[PDB]
UniProtKB/Swiss-Prot annotation:
This is Albumin. Glycans are attached at residues 9, 48, 134, 159, 196, 222, 230, 273, 278, 310, 314-315, 320, 348, 375, 410, 436, 441, 491, 522, 531, 533, 542, 570. Changing E498K: In Manaus-1/Adana/Lambadi/Vancouver. (4Z,15Z)-bilirubin IXalpha binds at K237. PROSITE patterns: ALBUMIN_1, ALBUMIN_2. Its main location: secreted. Changing D372N: In Nagasaki-2. InterPro entries: ALB/AFP/VDB, Serum_albumin-like, Serum_albumin/AFP/Afamin, Serum_albumin_CS, Serum_albumin_N. The record marks 1, 17, 38, 61, 70, 90, 103, 133, 156, 171, 178, 187, 192, 202, 209, 237, 259, 271, 283, 356, 369, 386, 399, 411, 429, 433, 463, 472, 497, 516, 521, 535, 538, 554, 557, 561, 571 as: Not glycated. Disulfide bonds join C50-C59, C72-C88, C87-C98, C121-C166, C165-C174, C197-C243, C242-C250, C262-C276, C275-C286, C313-C358, C357-C366, C389-C435, C434-C445, C458-C474, C473-C484, C511-C556, C555-C564. The gene is ALB. Residues 1-183, 184-376, 377-574 form the Albumin domain. It comes from Homo sapiens (Human).
Amino acid sequence: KSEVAHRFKDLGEENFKALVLIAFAQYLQQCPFEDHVKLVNEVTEFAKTCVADESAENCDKSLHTLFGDKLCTVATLRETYGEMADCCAKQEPERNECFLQHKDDNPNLPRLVRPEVDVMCTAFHDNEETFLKKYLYEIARRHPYFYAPELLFFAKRYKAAFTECCQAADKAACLLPKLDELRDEGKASSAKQRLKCASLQKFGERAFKAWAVARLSQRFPKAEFAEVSKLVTDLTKVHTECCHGDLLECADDRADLAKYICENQDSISSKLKECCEKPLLEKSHCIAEVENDEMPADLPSLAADFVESKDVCKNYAEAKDVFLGMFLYEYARRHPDYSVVLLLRLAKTYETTLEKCCAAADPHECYAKVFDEFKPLVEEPQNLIKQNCELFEQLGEYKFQNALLVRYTKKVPQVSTPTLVEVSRNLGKVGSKCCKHPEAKRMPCAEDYLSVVLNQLCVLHEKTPVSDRVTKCCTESLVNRRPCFSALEVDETYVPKEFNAETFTFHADICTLSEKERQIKKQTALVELVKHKPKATKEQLKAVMDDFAAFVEKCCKADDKETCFAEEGKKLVAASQAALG
Ligand SMILES: CCCCCCCCCCCCCC(=O)O
Ligand SMILES: CCCCCCCCCCCCCC(=O)O
Ligand SMILES: O=C(O)[C@]12C[C@H]3C[C@H](C[C@H](C3)C1)C2
Ligand SMILES: O=C(O)[C@]12C[C@H]3C[C@H](C[C@H](C3)C1)C2
C-alpha cells in the first residue's frame, strides 16, 4: 500500500498540491514562497511515481515519514529554525511530535496588506495560480494551526470573488465587500476552532460532550439517542485529535466520521444526501454545515419522562450523565430555535434540581416546578434579541454601533479605544446579520456570531488585561460567558481621561475616505469623548455628535478644507467642552 498514491488519487492533483503547500507553509513558516513551490513540485512528482506504481521505491513509506524526511532535507533547517532541526535526529513517531511542538502560533511576520483593487485584479489576471497560491502560503504560515482543508475551501471562495469582480464595471464596489465578508468568515472559522480546543482543555471532555449532544440533536432530531450518543463520542475523539494538531491524523478522523455518517443517513438525517455525494475532501465540511432536519411531528412533551415519572431519580442516579444527555437530546431536538448554550443552561438547571431533590424524602414534590425554572432562562435571551433587533431597525447599523460604543465604553472604559471600536462594530454586524432572520433562527445565529466576537475580545484581554470584570466573564464557563457580559454595569470608579486636543482634531481627507474608514475615525473619537466625559447623558452626547455632523457637513462642502477643519474644529471642541461642563 502507498498512502501517498491513495491520497493523490482521492484528492486529485490540484487539491493535493494546494494541501502540500499549506502543510509545508505551516511548518516552515519562514521559508520563501519559491522554496515551497519547489518542495510541492518534488512531492508531487514523487506522488505521481507512486500513482503509476504503488510498489515503486519509497512509495510504501507512511505519509508522516515522507513528510518528515522532506522537512529534514531542507538545507536551512538549522540556520532558520534552530531547535526544530534537532527533530531530524529522532525516528518516527517522536520526530513528527517534535515538529508539531515547534510550530509558532505568533510568528512575527508583517501584517498582510490589502493592496489596491486594480493591483490585485491585475496580478490575478497576470498569473492567477501564483497570485492565489502565494496568498495561500502567506496565510498558512501566519495561521499554522488553521485546518488545511478549511483554508483550501476559503481559497476557492476568494478565487471565485476575484473571477467575478475583476470582470465587472466597478471592480472595487463588487470586490471590497466580498473580501470583507470572507475576512470575517475566515476569522469566525479560525476563532471557532480555537474556541473548541481551549474549551476542551479548560473545561473538560464532559462539557464538550454536552455541547455536542445539544448541537447534534438540534441538527439530527430524527436520530435516536443512541445514534446521537455514538456521534458525540466519535466527534469528541475527532476534536481531541484535531486539537493535538496533527493534520493527517485529524483528517483521517474526520473522514472516518463522515464515512460513518453517510453510510447511516437513514438513521441520522434526510438532509445529508447532497453532502454524502461530495468527494472526501469536502464531505466532512459539508456535513458540519448541513441544515437542521425537520423534527418528528407529535413528539410528546418531556413532562412524562423528566418530571411526572416515579422513576426519575432512579434513572438519573444509575447513570447521571446518560440521563442528563437524554434530557438534553430531547430538549434540543424539539428546540432548534434555542442557542446551544441556552440548552446547556437548562440541562445544568435540571441537573442542579435533581441533585438537590433526589436527596429529599419526596423528590417528586421538590422537582415538580423544574420546568417553570426553564421559562425565565429561555425568555432572557429571546427578550434581549427582540430588544436589540428593534433598536437596530430604528437606528440602522451605524447608529446602532454607536449606541453600543457608548454603552460599552461606560461599562469597561479601561479597554483600549481600538478594541472598543472593533468589538462594538462587530456586535453591530451581528445585529445586521441575525436580525434579518425570523425569530426562530435568531438565537442560534446570535450565539454563533457573538461567540466569535466575545472570543476575539477575550483573546485581546487575556494578552493585555485591564479589567477584572472582563477577566471574570472571559474565564467563566463558556455557558455563562454571554450572561456575565450582559450583567456588566457602568464603571462607577473610573477616573475620566484628561482632555487632549489632538484626539479631537480632524482633517480634510475624512471627506474622501471610504465609509468604513470615515466611520472608524468618528467612532474612535466618540469613544475618546466618552472616556473623557463618562457621565455625559445621552442628550448631551447627541448634542455633541449633532454639532460634529454639522461641522463635517460644512467643512466637506468648503473650498478651503484644511483651514475650515482647523478653525471650525477649534470652535466645535470649545463649544463641546462647555456643553459637557
Ligand atoms: C448586540 C448585538 C447582537 C444582536 C442581538 C442581541 C444578542 C442577544 C444575546 C442572545 C443570546 C445568545 C446565546 C445565549 O447566551 O443564550
Ligand atoms: C471634549 C470635547 C471634544 C469633542 C468634540 C466633538 C467630538 C465628536 C464626536 C465623535 C464623533 C460622533 C459620531 C457621529 O456622529 O458619527
Ligand atoms: O486545488 C485547487 O483547485 C486550488 C488550489 C489553489 C489555487 C486555485 C484556487 C484554490 C487555491 C483551489 C486552485
Ligand atoms: O485584507 C484582506 O482581507 C485580504 C488581505 C490579502 C490576503 C487575503 C486576500 C486579499 C489580500 C485581501 C485577505
